[PDB]
Design a protein around this motif. Sequence first.
Motif, PDB file in Angstrom:
ATOM      1  N   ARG A   1       0.828  -1.186   0.000  1.00  0.00           N
ATOM      2  CA  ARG A   1       0.000   0.000   0.000  1.00  0.00           C
ATOM      3  C   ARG A   1       0.876   1.255   0.000  1.00  0.00           C
ATOM      4  N   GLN A   2       1.882   1.294   0.874  1.00  0.00           N
ATOM      5  CA  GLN A   2       2.778   2.417   0.974  1.00  0.00           C
ATOM      6  C   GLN A   2       3.705   2.509  -0.255  1.00  0.00           C
ATOM      7  N   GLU A   3       4.208   1.357  -0.734  1.00  0.00           N
ATOM      8  CA  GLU A   3       5.245   1.321  -1.754  1.00  0.00           C
ATOM      9  C   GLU A   3       4.665   1.818  -3.085  1.00  0.00           C
ATOM     10  N   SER A   4       3.455   1.387  -3.444  1.00  0.00           N
ATOM     11  CA  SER A   4       2.946   1.536  -4.795  1.00  0.00           C
ATOM     12  C   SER A   4       1.459   1.844  -4.893  1.00  0.00           C
ATOM     13  N   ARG A   5       0.739   1.793  -3.768  1.00  0.00           N
ATOM     14  CA  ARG A   5      -0.719   1.804  -3.818  1.00  0.00           C
ATOM     15  C   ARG A   5      -1.213   0.668  -4.714  1.00  0.00           C
ATOM     16  N   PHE A   6      -0.454  -0.443  -4.739  1.00  0.00           N
ATOM     17  CA  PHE A   6      -0.823  -1.627  -5.511  1.00  0.00           C
ATOM     18  C   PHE A   6      -0.837  -1.403  -7.035  1.00  0.00           C
TER      19      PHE A   6
ATOM     20  N   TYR B   1      13.072  -2.615   5.151  1.00  0.00           N
ATOM     21  CA  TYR B   1      12.574  -2.803   3.797  1.00  0.00           C
ATOM     22  C   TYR B   1      12.814  -1.534   2.975  1.00  0.00           C
ATOM     23  N   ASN B   2      12.734  -0.360   3.619  1.00  0.00           N
ATOM     24  CA  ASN B   2      12.852   0.909   2.910  1.00  0.00           C
ATOM     25  C   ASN B   2      14.313   1.377   2.859  1.00  0.00           C
ATOM     26  N   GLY B   3      15.058   1.189   3.963  1.00  0.00           N
ATOM     27  CA  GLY B   3      16.360   1.802   4.172  1.00  0.00           C
ATOM     28  C   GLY B   3      17.503   0.780   4.171  1.00  0.00           C
TER      29      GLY B   3
ATOM     30  N   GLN C   1      14.971  10.678   7.225  1.00  0.00           N
ATOM     31  CA  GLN C   1      13.620  11.199   7.145  1.00  0.00           C
ATOM     32  C   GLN C   1      12.671  10.241   6.427  1.00  0.00           C
ATOM     33  N   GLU C   2      13.068   9.742   5.276  1.00  0.00           N
ATOM     34  CA  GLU C   2      12.179   8.900   4.505  1.00  0.00           C
ATOM     35  C   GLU C   2      11.784   7.649   5.308  1.00  0.00           C
ATOM     36  N   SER C   3      12.741   7.083   6.040  1.00  0.00           N
ATOM     37  CA  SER C   3      12.575   5.797   6.704  1.00  0.00           C
ATOM     38  C   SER C   3      11.742   5.985   7.978  1.00  0.00           C
TER      39      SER C   3
ATOM     40  N   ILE D   1       9.393   8.275   8.295  1.00  0.00           N
ATOM     41  CA  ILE D   1       8.025   8.462   7.834  1.00  0.00           C
ATOM     42  C   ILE D   1       7.441   7.118   7.389  1.00  0.00           C
ATOM     43  N   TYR D   2       8.243   6.359   6.635  1.00  0.00           N
ATOM     44  CA  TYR D   2       7.812   5.104   6.038  1.00  0.00           C
ATOM     45  C   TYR D   2       7.328   4.151   7.131  1.00  0.00           C
ATOM     46  N   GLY D   3       8.092   4.062   8.219  1.00  0.00           N
ATOM     47  CA  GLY D   3       7.795   3.144   9.305  1.00  0.00           C
ATOM     48  C   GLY D   3       6.450   3.436   9.985  1.00  0.00           C
TER      49      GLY D   3
ATOM     50  N   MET E   1       5.651  -4.069  -5.009  1.00  0.00           N
ATOM     51  CA  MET E   1       6.478  -4.207  -3.824  1.00  0.00           C
ATOM     52  C   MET E   1       7.779  -3.426  -3.998  1.00  0.00           C
ATOM     53  N   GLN E   2       7.908  -2.721  -5.143  1.00  0.00           N
ATOM     54  CA  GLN E   2       8.980  -1.741  -5.311  1.00  0.00           C
ATOM     55  C   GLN E   2      10.353  -2.357  -5.017  1.00  0.00           C
ATOM     56  N   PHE E   3      10.687  -3.408  -5.783  1.00  0.00           N
ATOM     57  CA  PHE E   3      12.031  -3.968  -5.764  1.00  0.00           C
ATOM     58  C   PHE E   3      13.000  -3.163  -6.649  1.00  0.00           C
TER      59      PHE E   3
ATOM     60  N   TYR F   1      13.963   3.902  -9.866  1.00  0.00           N
ATOM     61  CA  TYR F   1      13.568   2.753 -10.689  1.00  0.00           C
ATOM     62  C   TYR F   1      13.344   1.472  -9.864  1.00  0.00           C
ATOM     63  N   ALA F   2      12.839   1.610  -8.625  1.00  0.00           N
ATOM     64  CA  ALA F   2      12.244   0.488  -7.907  1.00  0.00           C
ATOM     65  C   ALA F   2      10.970   0.099  -8.652  1.00  0.00           C
ATOM     66  N   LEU F   3      10.687  -1.225  -8.789  1.00  0.00           N
ATOM     67  CA  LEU F   3       9.651  -1.733  -9.694  1.00  0.00           C
ATOM     68  C   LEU F   3       8.534  -2.528  -8.991  1.00  0.00           C
TER      69      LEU F   3
ATOM     70  N   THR G   1       2.671  -1.684 -12.330  1.00  0.00           N
ATOM     71  CA  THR G   1       3.804  -1.164 -13.088  1.00  0.00           C
ATOM     72  C   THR G   1       4.386   0.110 -12.466  1.00  0.00           C
ATOM     73  N   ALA G   2       4.270   0.246 -11.136  1.00  0.00           N
ATOM     74  CA  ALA G   2       4.808   1.424 -10.477  1.00  0.00           C
ATOM     75  C   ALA G   2       6.314   1.444 -10.673  1.00  0.00           C
ATOM     76  N   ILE G   3       6.840   2.657 -10.924  1.00  0.00           N
ATOM     77  CA  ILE G   3       8.271   2.899 -11.024  1.00  0.00           C
ATOM     78  C   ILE G   3       8.611   4.149 -10.220  1.00  0.00           C
ATOM     79  N   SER G   4       9.548   4.004  -9.295  1.00  0.00           N
ATOM     80  CA  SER G   4      10.010   5.123  -8.499  1.00  0.00           C
ATOM     81  C   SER G   4      11.155   5.833  -9.227  1.00  0.00           C
ATOM     82  N   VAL G   5      11.577   6.959  -8.622  1.00  0.00           N
ATOM     83  CA  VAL G   5      12.574   7.847  -9.196  1.00  0.00           C
ATOM     84  C   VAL G   5      13.923   7.132  -9.174  1.00  0.00           C
TER      85      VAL G   5
HETATM   86  C1  LIG Z   1       5.825   4.725  -7.014  1.00  0.00           C
HETATM   87  C2  LIG Z   1       6.771   5.227  -5.957  1.00  0.00           C
HETATM   88  O1  LIG Z   1       7.508   6.185  -6.159  1.00  0.00           O
HETATM   89  N1  LIG Z   1       6.800   4.570  -4.783  1.00  0.00           N
HETATM   90  C3  LIG Z   1       7.499   5.021  -3.581  1.00  0.00           C
HETATM   91  C4  LIG Z   1       6.556   5.476  -2.433  1.00  0.00           C
HETATM   92  O2  LIG Z   1       5.800   6.600  -2.812  1.00  0.00           O
HETATM   93  C5  LIG Z   1       4.722   6.955  -1.907  1.00  0.00           C
HETATM   94  C6  LIG Z   1       3.504   7.362  -2.729  1.00  0.00           C
HETATM   95  C7  LIG Z   1       3.854   8.033  -4.070  1.00  0.00           C
HETATM   96  C8  LIG Z   1       3.554   6.964  -5.124  1.00  0.00           C
HETATM   97  C9  LIG Z   1       2.522   6.092  -4.456  1.00  0.00           C
HETATM   98  O3  LIG Z   1       1.651   5.410  -5.015  1.00  0.00           O
HETATM   99  N2  LIG Z   1       2.697   6.201  -3.129  1.00  0.00           N
HETATM  100  O4  LIG Z   1       7.283   5.894  -1.281  1.00  0.00           O
HETATM  101  C10 LIG Z   1       8.148   4.873  -0.738  1.00  0.00           C
HETATM  102  C11 LIG Z   1       8.768   5.479   0.503  1.00  0.00           C
HETATM  103  O5  LIG Z   1       7.769   5.773   1.462  1.00  0.00           O
HETATM  104  C12 LIG Z   1       9.177   4.406  -1.782  1.00  0.00           C
HETATM  105  O6  LIG Z   1       9.935   3.362  -1.158  1.00  0.00           O
HETATM  106  C13 LIG Z   1       8.466   3.937  -3.070  1.00  0.00           C
HETATM  107  O7  LIG Z   1       9.386   3.493  -4.075  1.00  0.00           O
END
Ligand SMILES: CC(=O)N[C@H]1[C@H](OC[C@H]2CCC(=O)N2)O[C@H](CO)[C@@H](O)[C@@H]1O
Length: 513
Positions: A370-375, A445-447, A479-481, A483-485, A389-391, A384-386, A378-382
């Motif tokens: 849910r956090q990684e891709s909103r499911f 998983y994030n960091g 910061q990212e990690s 928030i992610y947690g 589950m954004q591997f 290029y996590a894919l 074909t999600a691609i991050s900046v």
């Molecule tokens: C598609 C993308 O960029 N996914 C990233 C996600 O982005 C959060 C929002 C924006 C895109 C989306 O659907 N969810 O944030 C994570 C860190 O919290 C990263 O690990 C992911 O790779």
Amino acid sequence: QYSIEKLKKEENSLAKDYYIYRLLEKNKISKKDAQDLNSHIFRYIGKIKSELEKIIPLKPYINPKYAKCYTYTANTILDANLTCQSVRLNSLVFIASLNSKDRTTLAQTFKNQRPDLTNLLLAFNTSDPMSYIVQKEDINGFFKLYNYSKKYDLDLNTSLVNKLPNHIGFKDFAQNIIIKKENPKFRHSMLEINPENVSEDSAFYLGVNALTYDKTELAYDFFKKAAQSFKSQSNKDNAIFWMWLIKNNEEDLKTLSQSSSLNIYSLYAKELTNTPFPKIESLNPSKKKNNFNMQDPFAWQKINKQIRDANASQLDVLAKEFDTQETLPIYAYILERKNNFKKHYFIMPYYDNIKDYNKTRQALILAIARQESRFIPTAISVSYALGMMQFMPFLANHIGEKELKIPNFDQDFMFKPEIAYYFGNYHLNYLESRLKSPLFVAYAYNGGIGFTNRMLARNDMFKTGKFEPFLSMELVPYQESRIYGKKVLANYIVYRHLLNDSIKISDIFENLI
Ligand SMILES: CC(=O)N[C@H]1[C@H](OC[C@H]2CCC(=O)N2)O[C@H](CO)[C@@H](O)[C@@H]1O
């Protein structure tokens, strides 16, 4: 895969960047293909930029107007016109390079018109430029010195620290020194910032700062100002939680328990007050499919841009078009924006791939997705996590080729739900076996597990204490990690609840210590 010619035909997007990067990493972009290529790149940053620059180095950039200014060095800057002198003195390294007599000469030249330059010149004629700039209370000078070197550290009086927050650089300065536990004199000095002079994230961080010095009254006042000024309800709730933990006013906890934001703090407040679990939307489209290809990454980039730019009216058309089982992740994506982020959507798509795992594992997988891709498959991050589950390609190839030996494996297999869930499960098993807590797993998983292991080895992180484990969660050094947690943990609690495998968030917090 796609040739450079066919990619050029596509709109600029992260998906197009990803595929250009793949050519580059496989050395399939000739010098001739590379000529017009920076106009074909949506985000010319990081690895695609280093790779393209090995083929075509950067000829830019020094502005044509000041070109002559950059022909001078420290040995000839006195021969340069006054405009050129002032342009070059934008660099503190350049200033540091100058000899002391030329700093004196230039300080006089610029005293009337650019006393800022004068202050930095004469500061560098001393053995501690920071002390000189602090004594002048030159705020612009202070932030230029900090950006030049983090090692400068000095006590700042009440007058000076109260001036810092008006500078754009203040917020990242405060965050960085507080989270990294650097610049102790700066940090201690920031106890005397009037809460009236700060707001939002800065105020919040100055609360965390105050807690680390056991100044609980100052902390409360900072957190209260944060609660009042923060724009997002999620952040307000984080601040109101601290107000409650510190002073125990039951109105604060009551307010937190009634939040429209679903986050760990509002979930916890609801649990402490015997308030019912928040309402989770139920999305169950009767239509099975449409024409949309959920496996085409270019189609997602296109539709994503539409959805993000749609007025409230075109959202309704998109909503109906994507109201199918097959496009459920896009449907919920649209609904989330359509309902101005007020409703709670916690879908479980391609559920057949995980229904055989125990429910606690299902919830952690779903929480991460849910956090990684909103499911979005074909999600691609900046970076290029894919996929869902954004591997990252490296990890995807290690699992897919080395470990699982899947025949004809390609990293683009991560765009397939079956593969994303399977690899996610496999990787989550590795992390959970070492780390246990779903929160620790989220951080890793994030960091990465390296950063997580190092964080948990410290004496001051996730141990016993008055305000633990909440304080530790605010001091996670990326910061990212951090928030992610928090977000993944909320998601995990929710999915456990939906799967009829409830756990009290209070048990999760005990197991952090
Ligand atoms: C598609 C993308 O960029 N996914 C990233 C996600 O982005 C959060 C929002 C924006 C895109 C989306 O659907 N969810 O944030 C994570 C860190 O919290 C990263 O690990 C992911 O790779």
